[PDB]
Short mmCIF file of C-alpha atoms and ligand atoms in Angstrom, two decimals:
data_model
loop_
_atom_site.label_atom_id
_atom_site.label_comp_id
_atom_site.label_asym_id
_atom_site.label_seq_id
_atom_site.Cartn_x
_atom_site.Cartn_y
_atom_site.Cartn_z
CA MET A 1 -11.63 0.90 -11.36
CA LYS A 2 -8.68 -1.26 -10.92
CA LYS A 3 -5.17 -0.56 -9.02
CA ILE A 4 -2.08 -1.49 -11.02
CA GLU A 5 0.94 -1.80 -8.73
CA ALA A 6 4.34 -2.19 -10.54
CA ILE A 7 7.41 -2.92 -8.66
CA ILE A 8 10.33 -2.01 -10.89
CA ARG A 9 14.09 -1.31 -10.80
CA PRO A 10 14.92 2.20 -9.91
CA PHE A 11 16.47 3.61 -12.88
CA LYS A 12 13.71 2.32 -15.13
CA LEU A 13 11.30 4.66 -13.51
CA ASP A 14 11.82 7.69 -15.97
CA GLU A 15 11.52 5.15 -18.88
CA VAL A 16 8.37 3.71 -17.50
CA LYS A 17 6.92 6.94 -16.42
CA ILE A 18 7.02 8.73 -19.60
CA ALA A 19 5.23 5.68 -21.32
CA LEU A 20 2.38 5.87 -18.89
CA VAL A 21 1.93 9.62 -19.62
CA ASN A 22 1.70 8.72 -23.48
CA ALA A 23 -0.82 5.92 -22.46
CA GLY A 24 -3.20 8.85 -21.28
CA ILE A 25 -2.56 7.92 -17.64
CA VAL A 26 -3.33 11.15 -15.57
CA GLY A 27 -1.59 9.97 -12.36
CA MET A 28 0.52 7.70 -10.35
CA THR A 29 2.15 7.50 -6.93
CA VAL A 30 5.90 6.39 -6.46
CA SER A 31 7.30 4.97 -3.31
CA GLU A 32 10.89 3.42 -2.47
CA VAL A 33 10.91 -0.02 -1.26
CA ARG A 34 13.26 -2.99 -0.66
CA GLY A 35 12.55 -6.07 -2.19
CA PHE A 36 13.64 -9.80 -1.71
CA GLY A 37 15.66 -11.12 -2.99
CA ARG A 38 17.23 -13.10 -5.51
CA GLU A 54 19.53 -9.38 1.01
CA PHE A 55 17.39 -6.60 0.22
CA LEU A 56 17.58 -4.41 -3.04
CA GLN A 57 16.69 -0.85 -3.65
CA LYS A 58 13.45 -0.90 -5.82
CA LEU A 59 10.57 1.44 -6.67
CA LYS A 60 6.87 0.63 -6.26
CA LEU A 61 4.59 2.20 -8.69
CA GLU A 62 0.68 2.74 -8.05
CA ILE A 63 -1.52 3.78 -10.86
CA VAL A 64 -5.38 3.62 -10.68
CA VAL A 65 -6.97 3.35 -13.94
CA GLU A 66 -10.22 2.18 -15.48
CA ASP A 67 -10.92 -1.59 -16.17
CA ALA A 68 -10.49 -1.30 -19.92
CA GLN A 69 -6.76 0.10 -19.75
CA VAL A 70 -5.43 -2.30 -17.33
CA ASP A 71 -3.96 -4.94 -19.76
CA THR A 72 -2.71 -2.11 -22.01
CA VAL A 73 -0.89 -0.24 -19.26
CA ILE A 74 0.44 -3.47 -18.02
CA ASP A 75 1.81 -4.27 -21.60
CA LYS A 76 3.72 -0.94 -21.44
CA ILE A 77 5.14 -1.22 -18.08
CA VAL A 78 6.46 -4.57 -18.58
CA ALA A 79 7.73 -3.55 -22.12
CA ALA A 80 9.49 -0.59 -20.37
CA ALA A 81 10.67 -2.84 -17.23
CA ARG A 82 12.36 -5.31 -19.18
CA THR A 83 16.13 -5.36 -19.06
CA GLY A 84 18.02 -8.78 -19.57
CA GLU A 85 18.60 -10.37 -16.03
CA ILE A 86 16.56 -11.57 -13.05
CA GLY A 87 15.32 -9.24 -10.65
CA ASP A 88 13.20 -6.89 -13.21
CA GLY A 89 10.01 -6.48 -10.63
CA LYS A 90 6.57 -7.62 -10.55
CA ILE A 91 2.88 -6.29 -11.11
CA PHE A 92 -0.08 -6.65 -9.06
CA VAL A 93 -3.57 -5.67 -10.05
CA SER A 94 -6.20 -5.22 -7.16
CA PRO A 95 -9.79 -3.99 -7.07
CA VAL A 96 -10.70 -0.43 -6.29
CA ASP A 97 -14.27 0.42 -4.97
CA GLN A 98 -14.31 3.94 -4.86
CA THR A 99 -12.04 6.98 -5.85
CA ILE A 100 -12.71 10.66 -4.74
CA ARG A 101 -10.82 14.00 -5.45
CA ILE A 102 -10.29 16.03 -2.54
CA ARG A 103 -10.45 19.59 -3.94
CA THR A 104 -13.76 19.42 -5.70
CA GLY A 105 -15.34 16.26 -4.27
CA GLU A 106 -15.93 14.35 -7.32
CA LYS A 107 -16.30 10.59 -7.26
CA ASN A 108 -15.31 7.83 -9.72
CA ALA A 109 -14.63 8.60 -13.31
CA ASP A 110 -14.60 12.22 -12.62
CA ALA A 111 -11.97 11.73 -10.05
CA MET B 1 -13.60 -3.96 6.19
CA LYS B 2 -12.64 -1.24 3.96
CA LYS B 3 -9.10 0.26 3.33
CA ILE B 4 -9.03 3.95 2.87
CA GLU B 5 -5.80 5.18 1.01
CA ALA B 6 -5.56 8.96 1.15
CA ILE B 7 -2.84 10.62 -0.97
CA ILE B 8 -2.68 14.39 0.45
CA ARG B 9 -0.25 17.19 0.87
CA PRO B 10 2.32 16.65 3.71
CA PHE B 11 1.75 19.76 5.72
CA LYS B 12 -2.01 18.81 5.89
CA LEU B 13 -1.27 15.59 7.83
CA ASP B 14 -1.71 16.85 11.33
CA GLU B 15 -5.06 18.51 10.55
CA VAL B 16 -6.31 15.28 9.07
CA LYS B 17 -5.13 13.41 11.96
CA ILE B 18 -7.09 15.66 14.25
CA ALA B 19 -10.23 15.08 12.08
CA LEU B 20 -9.93 11.45 12.36
CA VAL B 21 -9.29 11.41 16.19
CA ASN B 22 -12.38 13.65 16.33
CA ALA B 23 -14.08 11.13 14.22
CA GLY B 24 -13.05 8.36 16.73
CA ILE B 25 -10.53 6.88 14.26
CA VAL B 26 -7.81 5.47 16.78
CA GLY B 27 -5.04 4.73 14.39
CA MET B 28 -3.69 5.12 10.86
CA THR B 29 -0.44 4.28 8.93
CA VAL B 30 1.41 6.80 6.95
CA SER B 31 4.17 6.47 4.32
CA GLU B 32 6.05 8.95 2.17
CA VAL B 33 5.54 9.09 -1.58
CA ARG B 34 5.95 11.02 -4.75
CA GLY B 35 3.06 12.02 -6.92
CA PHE B 36 1.94 13.56 -10.12
CA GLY B 37 -1.55 14.49 -10.96
CA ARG B 38 -3.49 17.29 -13.10
CA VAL B 53 10.86 15.45 -12.75
CA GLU B 54 7.32 15.96 -12.25
CA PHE B 55 7.04 14.43 -8.72
CA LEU B 56 5.83 16.10 -5.88
CA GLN B 57 6.41 15.22 -2.24
CA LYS B 58 3.14 13.71 -0.83
CA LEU B 59 2.02 11.74 2.24
CA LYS B 60 0.03 8.54 1.79
CA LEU B 61 -2.22 7.80 4.69
CA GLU B 62 -3.54 4.07 5.22
CA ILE B 63 -6.76 3.72 7.32
CA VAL B 64 -8.50 0.64 7.77
CA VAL B 65 -12.25 1.18 8.83
CA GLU B 66 -15.64 -0.28 8.99
CA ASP B 67 -17.81 -0.03 5.86
CA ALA B 68 -20.46 1.99 7.76
CA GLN B 69 -17.77 4.30 8.66
CA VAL B 70 -16.28 4.82 5.17
CA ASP B 71 -18.10 7.93 3.94
CA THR B 72 -18.00 9.70 7.10
CA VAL B 73 -14.33 9.24 7.32
CA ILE B 74 -13.91 10.29 3.68
CA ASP B 75 -16.16 13.40 4.53
CA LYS B 76 -13.72 14.27 7.44
CA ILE B 77 -10.56 13.76 5.35
CA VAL B 78 -11.76 15.80 2.45
CA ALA B 79 -12.72 18.48 4.84
CA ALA B 80 -9.40 18.88 6.39
CA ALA B 81 -7.10 17.96 3.36
CA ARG B 82 -8.79 20.38 1.12
CA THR B 83 -7.30 23.54 0.08
CA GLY B 84 -9.07 24.68 -3.13
CA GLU B 85 -6.10 24.57 -5.41
CA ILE B 86 -5.04 21.92 -7.79
CA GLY B 87 -2.73 19.04 -6.12
CA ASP B 88 -5.06 18.36 -3.24
CA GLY B 89 -4.67 14.66 -4.01
CA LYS B 90 -7.02 11.58 -3.95
CA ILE B 91 -8.71 8.75 -1.94
CA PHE B 92 -9.13 5.38 -3.04
CA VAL B 93 -11.33 2.78 -1.06
CA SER B 94 -10.26 -0.85 -1.60
CA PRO B 95 -11.66 -4.08 0.04
CA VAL B 96 -9.87 -5.79 2.68
CA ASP B 97 -10.71 -9.55 3.11
CA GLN B 98 -9.22 -9.94 6.84
CA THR B 99 -7.76 -7.74 9.54
CA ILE B 100 -6.04 -8.88 12.64
CA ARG B 101 -4.40 -7.38 15.36
CA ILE B 102 -1.02 -9.09 16.10
CA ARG B 103 -0.70 -8.43 19.69
CA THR B 104 -4.03 -9.87 20.85
CA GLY B 105 -5.42 -11.81 18.00
CA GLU B 106 -8.51 -10.16 17.58
CA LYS B 107 -10.23 -9.74 14.26
CA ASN B 108 -12.52 -7.18 12.29
CA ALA B 109 -13.73 -4.12 14.09
CA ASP B 110 -11.82 -5.19 17.45
CA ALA B 111 -8.63 -5.07 15.37
CA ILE B 112 -8.81 -1.25 14.54
CA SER B 113 -10.87 0.12 17.67
CA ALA B 114 -9.75 0.16 21.26
CA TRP B 115 -11.89 1.14 24.42
CA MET C 1 -4.74 -14.48 -5.22
CA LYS C 2 -4.40 -12.58 -2.17
CA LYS C 3 -2.10 -9.99 -0.52
CA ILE C 4 -0.94 -10.31 2.87
CA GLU C 5 0.13 -6.93 4.25
CA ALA C 6 1.72 -6.95 7.65
CA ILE C 7 2.75 -3.79 9.67
CA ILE C 8 5.14 -4.79 12.09
CA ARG C 9 7.91 -3.44 14.44
CA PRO C 10 11.11 -2.96 12.64
CA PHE C 11 13.35 -5.24 14.84
CA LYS C 12 10.91 -8.13 14.04
CA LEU C 13 11.48 -8.04 10.44
CA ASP C 14 14.42 -10.68 10.45
CA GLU C 15 12.49 -12.92 12.86
CA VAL C 16 9.35 -12.88 10.65
CA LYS C 17 11.49 -13.07 7.47
CA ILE C 18 13.10 -16.49 9.01
CA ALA C 19 9.44 -17.70 9.44
CA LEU C 20 8.72 -16.93 6.00
CA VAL C 21 11.99 -18.69 4.68
CA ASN C 22 10.93 -21.75 6.69
CA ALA C 23 7.36 -21.32 5.26
CA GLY C 24 8.55 -21.69 1.82
CA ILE C 25 8.12 -18.07 0.64
CA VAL C 26 10.32 -17.19 -2.02
CA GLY C 27 10.01 -13.23 -2.16
CA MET C 28 8.54 -10.29 -0.29
CA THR C 29 8.76 -6.54 -0.57
CA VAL C 30 9.20 -4.39 2.66
CA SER C 31 8.67 -0.58 2.98
CA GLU C 32 9.49 1.93 5.73
CA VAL C 33 6.26 3.72 7.26
CA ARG C 34 5.15 5.80 10.04
CA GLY C 35 2.42 4.77 12.13
CA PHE C 36 -0.17 6.06 14.63
CA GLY C 37 -2.19 4.07 17.29
CA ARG C 38 -2.09 3.76 20.78
CA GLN C 39 1.73 3.47 21.52
CA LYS C 40 3.66 6.65 21.61
CA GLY C 41 6.81 7.88 23.21
CA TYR C 51 6.86 17.05 23.17
CA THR C 52 6.06 13.43 22.90
CA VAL C 53 6.44 10.78 19.89
CA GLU C 54 4.15 11.52 17.03
CA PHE C 55 4.28 8.88 14.35
CA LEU C 56 6.44 5.65 15.13
CA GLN C 57 8.71 3.89 12.90
CA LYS C 58 7.31 0.66 11.52
CA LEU C 59 7.86 -1.80 8.76
CA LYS C 60 5.35 -2.65 6.02
CA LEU C 61 5.42 -6.09 4.56
CA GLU C 62 3.72 -6.93 1.34
CA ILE C 63 3.24 -10.69 0.16
CA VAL C 64 1.07 -12.06 -2.51
CA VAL C 65 0.30 -15.75 -2.09
CA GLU C 66 -2.48 -17.98 -3.32
CA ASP C 67 -5.58 -18.23 -0.83
CA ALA C 68 -4.72 -21.60 0.44
CA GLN C 69 -1.35 -20.22 1.72
CA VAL C 70 -2.97 -17.23 3.50
CA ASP C 71 -3.94 -18.49 6.94
CA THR C 72 -0.65 -20.26 7.32
CA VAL C 73 1.44 -17.31 6.52
CA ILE C 74 -0.37 -15.11 8.69
CA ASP C 75 -0.16 -17.61 11.56
CA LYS C 76 3.35 -17.72 10.94
CA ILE C 77 3.79 -13.65 10.89
CA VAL C 78 1.68 -13.38 14.02
CA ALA C 79 3.79 -16.04 15.76
CA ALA C 80 7.04 -14.12 14.79
CA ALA C 81 6.09 -10.42 15.12
CA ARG C 82 4.26 -10.62 18.29
CA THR C 83 5.39 -9.48 21.68
CA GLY C 84 2.64 -9.18 23.86
CA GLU C 85 2.87 -5.23 24.25
CA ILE C 86 1.23 -2.49 22.75
CA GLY C 87 2.64 -1.46 19.17
CA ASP C 88 3.25 -5.07 17.79
CA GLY C 89 1.31 -3.89 14.42
CA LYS C 90 -1.48 -5.09 12.04
CA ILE C 91 -2.19 -7.56 9.24
CA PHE C 92 -4.79 -6.74 6.50
CA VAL C 93 -5.28 -9.33 3.68
CA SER C 94 -6.73 -7.83 0.52
CA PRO C 95 -7.82 -9.54 -2.95
CA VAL C 96 -5.57 -9.39 -5.83
CA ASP C 97 -6.86 -9.97 -9.20
CA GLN C 98 -3.87 -10.64 -11.04
CA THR C 99 -0.12 -11.03 -10.61
CA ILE C 100 2.47 -10.66 -13.44
CA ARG C 101 6.26 -11.13 -13.75
CA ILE C 102 8.07 -8.57 -15.93
CA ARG C 103 10.84 -10.53 -17.22
CA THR C 104 8.79 -13.41 -19.03
CA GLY C 105 5.14 -12.19 -18.87
CA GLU C 106 4.00 -15.02 -16.57
CA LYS C 107 0.66 -14.74 -14.75
CA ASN C 108 -0.97 -15.89 -11.58
CA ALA C 109 0.62 -18.62 -9.84
CA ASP C 110 3.67 -18.84 -12.15
CA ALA C 111 4.73 -15.28 -11.48
CA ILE C 112 5.06 -15.57 -7.62
CA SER C 113 6.11 -19.22 -7.11
CA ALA C 114 9.35 -21.34 -7.90
N1 ADP D 1 -4.51 7.70 -11.18
C1 ADP D 1 -3.56 7.86 -10.16
N2 ADP D 1 -3.24 6.99 -9.32
C2 ADP D 1 -2.69 7.07 -8.01
N3 ADP D 1 -2.50 8.36 -7.52
C3 ADP D 1 -2.87 9.41 -8.28
C4 ADP D 1 -3.40 9.47 -9.67
N4 ADP D 1 -3.85 10.43 -9.77
C5 ADP D 1 -3.37 11.49 -9.00
N5 ADP D 1 -2.91 10.89 -7.98
C6 ADP D 1 -2.11 11.32 -6.60
O1 ADP D 1 -2.86 12.62 -6.56
C7 ADP D 1 -1.88 13.79 -6.52
C8 ADP D 1 -2.36 14.95 -7.46
O2 ADP D 1 -3.60 15.00 -7.32
P1 ADP D 1 -4.31 15.81 -8.43
O3 ADP D 1 -4.70 15.01 -9.73
O4 ADP D 1 -3.59 17.07 -8.79
O5 ADP D 1 -5.78 16.19 -7.78
P2 ADP D 1 -6.70 17.41 -8.27
O6 ADP D 1 -7.30 17.11 -9.68
O7 ADP D 1 -7.56 17.44 -7.30
O8 ADP D 1 -5.73 18.63 -8.37
C9 ADP D 1 -0.56 13.09 -7.12
O9 ADP D 1 0.63 13.78 -6.25
C10 ADP D 1 -0.61 11.61 -7.11
O10 ADP D 1 0.24 11.28 -5.95
N1 ADP D 2 5.46 -12.41 -2.51
C1 ADP D 2 5.73 -11.34 -3.08
N2 ADP D 2 5.24 -10.20 -2.96
C2 ADP D 2 5.49 -9.09 -3.57
N3 ADP D 2 6.89 -9.02 -4.45
C3 ADP D 2 7.53 -10.13 -4.45
C4 ADP D 2 7.25 -11.33 -3.85
N4 ADP D 2 8.16 -12.03 -4.13
C5 ADP D 2 9.16 -11.54 -4.80
N5 ADP D 2 8.73 -10.10 -4.94
C6 ADP D 2 9.49 -9.18 -5.60
O1 ADP D 2 10.32 -9.68 -6.65
C7 ADP D 2 11.69 -8.99 -6.70
C8 ADP D 2 12.78 -9.79 -6.99
O2 ADP D 2 12.47 -10.91 -7.17
P1 ADP D 2 12.90 -12.25 -6.32
O3 ADP D 2 11.73 -13.01 -5.64
O4 ADP D 2 14.05 -11.80 -5.58
O5 ADP D 2 13.31 -13.42 -7.24
P2 ADP D 2 13.08 -13.41 -9.03
O6 ADP D 2 13.57 -11.99 -9.62
O7 ADP D 2 13.63 -14.72 -9.27
O8 ADP D 2 11.55 -13.12 -8.90
C9 ADP D 2 11.77 -8.37 -5.26
O9 ADP D 2 12.05 -7.01 -5.22
C10 ADP D 2 10.23 -8.42 -4.56
O10 ADP D 2 9.93 -7.22 -4.06
N1 ADP D 3 -6.40 2.02 10.90
C1 ADP D 3 -5.24 1.57 10.58
N2 ADP D 3 -4.85 1.37 9.64
C2 ADP D 3 -3.28 1.20 9.11
N3 ADP D 3 -2.65 0.94 10.27
C3 ADP D 3 -2.88 0.86 11.45
C4 ADP D 3 -4.35 1.25 11.81
N4 ADP D 3 -4.43 1.43 13.13
C5 ADP D 3 -3.15 1.12 13.71
N5 ADP D 3 -2.28 0.83 12.74
C6 ADP D 3 -0.86 0.45 12.92
O1 ADP D 3 -0.59 -0.08 14.05
C7 ADP D 3 0.62 0.43 14.61
C8 ADP D 3 0.45 1.02 16.15
O2 ADP D 3 -0.94 0.78 16.37
P1 ADP D 3 -1.50 0.05 18.13
O3 ADP D 3 -2.66 0.70 18.44
O4 ADP D 3 0.01 0.20 18.91
O5 ADP D 3 -1.49 -1.46 17.54
P2 ADP D 3 -1.68 -2.48 18.87
O6 ADP D 3 -2.72 -2.31 19.67
O7 ADP D 3 -1.68 -3.89 17.78
O8 ADP D 3 -0.34 -2.58 19.43
C9 ADP D 3 0.85 2.04 13.92
O9 ADP D 3 2.24 1.99 13.66
C10 ADP D 3 -0.01 1.74 12.78
O10 ADP D 3 0.98 1.54 11.65
#
């Protein structure tokens, strides 16, 4: 259980997002943030919780989607997730 | 220390909050996000509550109890490790930093 | 790699930022959040707060924390919190750099 967090350029969202649904990723959460700096630029923060096996793959897509041509495209941080539970049912881990 | 991140339906916020206060949770942090889970993005709330390991499950059980509706889209909860938690005002650490009597 | 997350008072941003610029921090990401604690202000529900996310090497963690605390503290209720969480990987989109290469200049 890993959390991939990709801060990217706003307009790239759609492009990236579509790729992710084609990767078999069920869900993600997008927030709007400001980034610094090269003073603060409008950027999107993508949070996707996936299985350990898919991390690199997902990453490889995100970067592929988020690349442009100039400095400031974004960053990607992978963090551990200890537990994931679904609210409607109460399922845990892989079921969620 | 553990970090509970609950993506829930917006209107449920208040209810959840009450549960947490009745759970003895003093504080939390809420941000606005858009989510999709089975264009397709829905307005949802993100609650961030840092608790003690021992308190994790109970808190979860409360959150789920409050944020549940029974319909698809209720949201999810992720527990992640936090290596340090410090209160800025005092300099307190761990349980002291997120509890106040 | 470690992720320092500092939820602070809005107006303190600049100030903390200055510390970080003096700390040798190249970049950071700030989001706007609502918070709940002891401080309030019907009566104020959730209060406007800033969320800072900085990914650094473990060695730089304490120093940065000590800087942030030095800058964002007031002595009154509502100053905020700081949580450090582990980060297993950090990647730059442009090149594909990993770890220390992706967040340092
Ligand atoms: N893999 C994921 N990573 C992060 N957030 C997710 C993920 N999957 C779903 N979510 C969040 O959950 C919400 C929808 O939950 P959903 O999957 O519909 O729950 P359920 O299956 O119980 O209906 C979305 O708005 C999204 O914010
Ligand atoms: N320490 C950090 N933690 C999280 N995000 C960062 C950090 N440093 C830079 N970033 C992200 O990188 C984006 C822009 O990169 P910047 O640091 O301005 O120069 P460069 O594009 O050369 O990396 C910013 O939006 C910011 O959110
Ligand atoms: N468990 C928690 N998780 C996340 N953020 C918290 C938590 N407890 C408090 N906070 C943050 O602290 C702010 C106010 O809390 P408060 O009790 O005034 O802290 P302090 O006692 O350090 O002044 C809120 O805006 C909230 O974002």
